[PDB]
Amino acid sequence: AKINQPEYKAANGKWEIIEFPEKYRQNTIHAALLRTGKVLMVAGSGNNQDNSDDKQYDTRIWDPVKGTIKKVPTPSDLFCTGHTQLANGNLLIAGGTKRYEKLKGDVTKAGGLMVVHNENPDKPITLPAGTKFTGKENGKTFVSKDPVLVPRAEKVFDGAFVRNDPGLGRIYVEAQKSGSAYETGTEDNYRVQGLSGADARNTYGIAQKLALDKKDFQGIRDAFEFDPVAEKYIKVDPMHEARAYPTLTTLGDGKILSVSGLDDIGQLVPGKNEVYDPKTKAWTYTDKVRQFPTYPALFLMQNGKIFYSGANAGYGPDDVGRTPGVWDVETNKFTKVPGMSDANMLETANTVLLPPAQDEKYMVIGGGGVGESKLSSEKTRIADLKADDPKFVDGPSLEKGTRYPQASILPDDSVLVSGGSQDYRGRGDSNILQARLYHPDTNEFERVADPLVGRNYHSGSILLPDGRLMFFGSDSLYADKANTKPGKFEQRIEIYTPPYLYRDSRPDLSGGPQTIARGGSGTFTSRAASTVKKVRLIRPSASTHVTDVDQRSIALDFKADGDKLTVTVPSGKNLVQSGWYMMFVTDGEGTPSKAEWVRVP
């Protein structure tokens, strides 16, 4: 196909690779558009064992207008963090990792770390090599290769006796036979074969997935605010819980909820959630437990409750926190939302609050089966949360089952859905080089230009102020279709220019940056004011692991008079979260202006 011709671009847009000078390359795993118009690109150690060992941590700031890039000193391994924009435009970033060593054993046999629990405070227990552990739910058996000493449970005192904290002993376990049939994909509690009586009651294992991509993966408590003006990470109070892969999401009071993650020995945080108050720069536990898998897609609804779409990055059990629903964080009540197709393929799915955000329609896109499953979903599922009895209904389908699809809201109310892979971490060279625009008004997909670079695990996408989009990342497990050689992280970046920039001249817009309060108005200059049909306030993305709880596009009422455009911000802090937004105006041809920045107090 002649993809650079004017007619083709007018219908399909165009992709371009940017490669950075080698000095500035990194394995970008998170990115966020900052209110300065620059993009924060966070690698941390970049899922690179050498960098993890050396404590080599990387961040960049990229100026898309100037093309320039700089390094930012990175104080901790911010790979594996959660992050969201605060009301002042700083990016709260919390959690991370201190380890993800590849585990040694037979590469053809499922395995990983078993955390053995000893509830007996009176004695330790040693389990010899060749101890068999059987998943109480999964029915699968794994064998240790070395002995493990599990310490006595530690008595905890006020000095009155409270309880016993179980002794914990980690040990590598492996399937007896080769092959994927012996893998697990979710946490289970494991029976230790050969114990009886008290030892049986008191000794059991907990393990996350025991499969072929084997890692010892541990969280940290660190938290920072990234200040986009200073261009630096500012240390704030650490979280109470160590968390690799938490979601951070803004509540109706403007405080930030931190949910889930793996703890400091690789166990799922057991529903112990916490709230950051930006006014105190401190964290407080919520009162009651509510457990989810990692990177749960959690969005603030107009009634102040949190919508969990079901999309997540995995870990934890298959039967807690896996159903979509509406969570009242203050009461802790959770009400499941029915109707999700491919409810067994929600790991690595994307979630978008469709434009306009007023409508409270959420779309879940693609996904795959738990852990290293070969299952992948071609479906979209849409829930309308304004309904009295909300439910998911299928939307338009993709051509192929797709893990890891990128999904970015555009200023014309389309959603760009691109990339992903048909299988786990792109294995079998399964990157899908396809892009589509979802049109909420027709409920259909329109195929657009194919991306140039494949993007699976550890990818993402960011809408820029000029209306183009940046795509980053991709961490294939293997380099080849045969799955014999290790993959190399994708360091190339792409810019996608949508069809709307291959049309007539775009509307002009000036008068930013401005502060405009909810329920208030601001006036801008546009010579093309009388052509404007839509005004959108779009929250900048913070994207990682197929998860972006920041992006949303809010419709604004407006009036044009001559070259003056007056816009009014909607009421409701649950809708228009405080913070910085891109304001785009779009004409009757569907062509957007470049954005002006608007701060909502």
Per DSSP, the three-state class of 202 is helix
Task: Locate the DSSP E strands across 182-333.
Answer: 188-192, 203-207, 215-219, 223-227, 232-235, 247-250, 256-259, 274-277, 282-285, 298-300, 306-308, 325-327
Find the shortest distance in angstroms from Cβ 545 to Cu ion.
6
Closer by beta carbon to Cu ion, 395 or else 473: 473
- How many C-beta atoms lie closer than 10 Å to residue 421's C-beta? 31
Closer by beta carbon to Cu ion, 50 or else 158: 50
Find the shortest distance in angstroms from Cβ 29 to Cu ion.
6
Binding status of residue 53 toward Cu ion by CB under 5 A: yes
Write the secondary structure of 31-93 as one string of H (helix), E (strand) and C (coil): EEECCCCCEEEEEECCCCHHHHHHCCCEEEEECCCCCCEEEECCCCCCCCEEEEECCCCCEEE
Find the shortest distance in angstroms from Cβ 114 to Cu ion.
20
The answer to whether the peptide bond before residue 513 is cis (omega within 30 degrees of 0) is yes
* Residue at 405: amino acid letter: P
Find the shortest distance in angstroms from Cβ 347 to Cu ion.
12
Please choose, out of 46-54, 86-94, 144-152, 416-424, the segment that lies near Cu ion by the rule CB under 5 A: 46-54
Find the shortest distance in angstroms from Cβ 415 to Cu ion.
24
d(Cα 175, Cα 304) in Å, to the nearest integer?
46
Closer by beta carbon to Cu ion, 15 or else 472: 472
Closer by beta carbon to Cu ion, 41 or else 595: 41
Closer by beta carbon to Cu ion, 262 or else 326: 262
Find the shortest distance in angstroms from Cβ 101 to Cu ion.
4
DSSP string over 104-161: PS-TTS-EEEEEEEE--SS--EEEPTT-EEEETTT--EEEESS-EEEPPPEEEE---E
- The residue count for binding Cu ion (CB under 5 A) is 2
Please choose, out of 48-56, 172-180, 274-282, 583-591, the segment that lies near Cu ion by the rule CB under 5 A: 48-56
Find the shortest distance in angstroms from Cβ 475 to Cu ion.
8
Closer by beta carbon to Cu ion, 473 or else 498: 473
Query: Which conformational region is residue 512 in: left (phi greater than 0), alpha (psi within -120 to 50 degrees), or beta?
Result: beta
Closer by beta carbon to Cu ion, 100 or else 204: 100
Closer by beta carbon to Cu ion, 101 or else 504: 101
- For residue 445, give the nearest of 407, 493, 471 by alpha carbon: 407
Closer by beta carbon to Cu ion, 187 or else 596: 187
Strands 298-300 and 444-447: unpaired
Closer by beta carbon to Cu ion, 53 or else 319: 53
d(Cα 382, Cα 362) in Å, to the nearest integer?
5
Please choose, out of 47-55, 155-163, 204-212, 560-568, the segment that lies near Cu ion by the rule CB under 5 A: 47-55
Strands 514-515 and 596-600: parallel
Q: Are 79 and 56 in contact (CB under 8 A)?
A: no
Of residues 243-302, those binding Cu ion (CB under 5 A): none
Closer by beta carbon to Cu ion, 49 or else 302: 49
- For residue 543, give the nearest of 25, 11, 34, 5 by alpha carbon: 34
Find the shortest distance in angstroms from Cβ 530 to Cu ion.
48
Quickly tell me which residue has 């011709």 as its tokens: 5
Question: Given CA atoms 576, 582, 586, 592 in this order, what sign does their dihedral have?
Answer: negative
Find the shortest distance in angstroms from Cβ 583 to Cu ion.
33
**Residue numbers preceding breaks in the chain (C to N > 2.5 A):** 158
Binding status of residue 63 toward Cu ion by CB under 5 A: no
Find the shortest distance in angstroms from Cβ 466 to Cu ion.
29
Which residue's Cβ has the minimum distance to Cu ion?
53
Of residues 71-130, those binding Cu ion (CB under 5 A): 101
Closer by beta carbon to Cu ion, 101 or else 399: 101
H helical segments located in 187-325: 197-202
Binding status of residue 54 toward Cu ion by CB under 5 A: no
Closer by beta carbon to Cu ion, 19 or else 101: 101
Please choose, out of 45-53, 199-207, 393-401, 425-433, the segment that lies near Cu ion by the rule CB under 5 A: 45-53
Residues with Cβ within 8 Å of 505's Cβ and at least 6 positions away in sequence, in order, are 591
Find the shortest distance in angstroms from Cβ 167 to Cu ion.
26
Residues with Cβ within 8 Å of 49's Cβ and at least 6 positions away in sequence, in order, are 100, 101, 102
Find the shortest distance in angstroms from Cβ 28 to Cu ion.
12
* Residue at 318: amino acid letter: D
Find the shortest distance in angstroms from Cβ 482 to Cu ion.
24
b/e code 479-510 from CB counts within 10 Å (16+ = b): eeeebeeebebbbbbbbbbbbbbbeeebbebe
* Residue at 555: amino acid letter: A
b/e code 560-570 from CB counts within 10 Å (16+ = b): eeeeebbbbbb
d(Cα 474, Cα 449) in Å, to the nearest integer?
19
Per CB under 5 A, residues contacting Cu ion are 53, 101
